[PDB]
Amino acid sequence: KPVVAIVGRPNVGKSTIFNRIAERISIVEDTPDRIYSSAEWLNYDFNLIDTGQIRQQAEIAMDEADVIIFMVNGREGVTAADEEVAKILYRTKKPVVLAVNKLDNMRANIYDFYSLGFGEPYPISGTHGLGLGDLLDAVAEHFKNIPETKYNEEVIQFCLIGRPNVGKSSLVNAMLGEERVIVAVDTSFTYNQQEFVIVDTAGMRKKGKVYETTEKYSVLRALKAIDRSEVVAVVLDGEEGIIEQDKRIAGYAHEAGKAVVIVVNKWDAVDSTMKEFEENIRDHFQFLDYAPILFMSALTKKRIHTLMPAIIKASENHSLRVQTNVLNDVIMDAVAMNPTPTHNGSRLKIYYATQVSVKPPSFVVFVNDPELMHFSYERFLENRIRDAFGFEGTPIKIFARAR
Numbered sequence: 001k002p003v004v005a006i007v008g009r010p011n012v013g014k015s016t017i018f019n020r021i022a023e024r025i026s027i028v029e030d031t032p033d034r035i036y037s038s039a040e041w042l043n044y045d046f047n048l049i050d051t052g053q054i055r056q057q058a059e060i061a062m063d064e065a066d067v068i069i070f071m072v073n074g075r076e077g078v079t080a081a082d083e084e085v086a087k088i089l090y091r092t093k094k095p096v097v098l099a100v101n102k103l104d105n106m107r108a109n110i111y112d113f114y115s116l117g118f119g120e121p122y123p124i125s126g127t128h129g130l131g132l133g134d135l136l137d138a139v140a141e142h143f144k145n146i147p148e149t150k151y152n153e154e155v156i157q158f159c160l161i162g163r164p165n166v167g168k169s170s171l172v173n174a175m176l177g178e179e180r181v182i183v184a185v186d187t188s189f190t191y192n193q194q195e196f197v198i199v200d201t202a203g204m205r206k207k208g209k210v211y212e213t214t215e216k217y218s219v220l221r222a223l224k225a226i227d228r229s230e231v232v233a234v235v236l237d238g239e240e241g242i243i244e245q246d247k248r249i250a251g252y253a254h255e256a257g258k259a260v261v262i263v264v265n266k267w268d269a270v271d272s273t274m275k276e277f278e279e280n281i282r283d284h285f286q287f288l289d290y291a292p293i294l295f296m297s298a299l300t301k302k303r304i305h306t307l308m309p310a311i312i313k314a315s316e317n318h319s320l321r322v323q324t325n326v327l328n329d330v331i332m333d334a335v336a337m338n339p340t341p342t343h344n345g346s347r348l349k350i351y352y353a354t355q356v357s358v359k360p361p362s363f364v365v366f367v368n369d370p371e372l373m374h375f376s377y378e379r380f381l382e383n384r385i386r387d388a389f390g391f392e393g394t395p396i397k398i399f400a401r402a403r
């Protein structure tokens with residue numbers, strides 16, 4: 001069932017590798033010309049795809065395929081022509097893997113290929129079919145995060161999670177009632193003529209034809225939605241306040257690496273009370289600090305509009321992709337301020353940094369010794385980055401590898 005797309009500028013072995021992991025399909029059940037299932041022998045199954053200036057491939061590809069293999073040529077390196085393909089493929093929420101043709105994993109030791117910014121290279125000799133098992137290992141994993149429900153990439157998916165009676169049902173409509181908004185297990189609406197989807201909106205429709213089973217099945221119901229949403233809205237109870245489950249479902253988002261927002265509903269029904277309740281939230285949600293605290297009301301529409309904007313802001317950042325050149329200026333700037341730690345002689349060195357993921361954005365820092373980068377410096381960098389391009393709404397992770 002999964003769908004994989006080899007992409008890259010022409011004359012890089014795209015056509016070679018395809019035959020490696022190729023029989024064709026014709027008049028059999030499908031959601032599509034020129035589709036193939038995986039080379040039957042192979043460990044796993046999925047569909048391959050022929051995509052038919054390369055902008056046409058790149059879009060048609062990321063229209064119809066949930067894991068994309070972008071393939072350069074390492075005979076003579078990261079071509080000018082290549083960097084524009086990457087630039088096209090930066091506009092996708094789907095995974096991407098980096099095939100580097102004709103190399104020894106040795107000839108692979110090139111920071112240039114990391115720059116392109118889709119993570120680690122995976123070298124592949126093509127004629128001998130070396131280094132390929134690792135590639136399909138790096139691809140297949142993503143099959144485990146492909147949702148069985150799919151939308152156009154320009155659709156934006158989100159959810160209103162929390163404990164019961166807090167506002168979830170009331171508050172969804174108040175938004176839909178606004179004139180900017182224009183009205184299937186989910187609600188598929190538009191705002192400013194742009195598609196939107198509140199994921200599992202039967203979190204409302206089910207609970208009122210059905211006596212409330214128990215905490216377990218509803219939370220699970222919610223965490224399953226979170227797996228499909230890009231922005232979560234953790235929507236509290238303004239009278240009642242903090243607890244277990246709010247935190248529990250809200251902690252899963254950060255641990256899923258999800259764009260979070262903190263809505264405080266039933267604020268009409270509240271009599272300094274903000275900033276004491278804010279730092280009360282920031283105490284008990286001291287990981288969610290990037291995410292903004294909204295003090296709206298569903299019942300009286302108070303600040304109801306302070307919402308879809310904040311989502312778009314969070315959704316925009318969750319995707320937001322930084323230039324490798326600027327980023328390193330920021331990082332070189334980091335150390336000149338605060339020198340790296342001493343481990344009595346052995347000091348940490350930061351050679352080179354680069355973006356690799358999004359949803360949520362993720363950076364690798366290349367160093368002399370990974371464990372020498374203690375978490376303290378790791379966050380210092382994180383805090384520096386956020387004072388540069390904001391990223392206010394989203395989590396970001398910072399891995400680190402030996403050069």
Ligand SMILES: Nc1nc2c(ncn2[C@@H]2O[C@H](COP(=O)(O)OP(=O)(O)O)[C@@H](O)[C@H]2O)c(=O)[nH]1
Pocket residue numbers: 163164165166167168169170171299
């Ligand atoms: N009087 C009163 N009304 C409540 C109480 N709890 C909930 N409600 C009402 O029921 C609604 C519950 O909100 P809802 O959006 O359904 O939250 P959800 O059930 O978690 O989606 C509120 O807007 C309140 O008017 C309560 O303790 N007292």
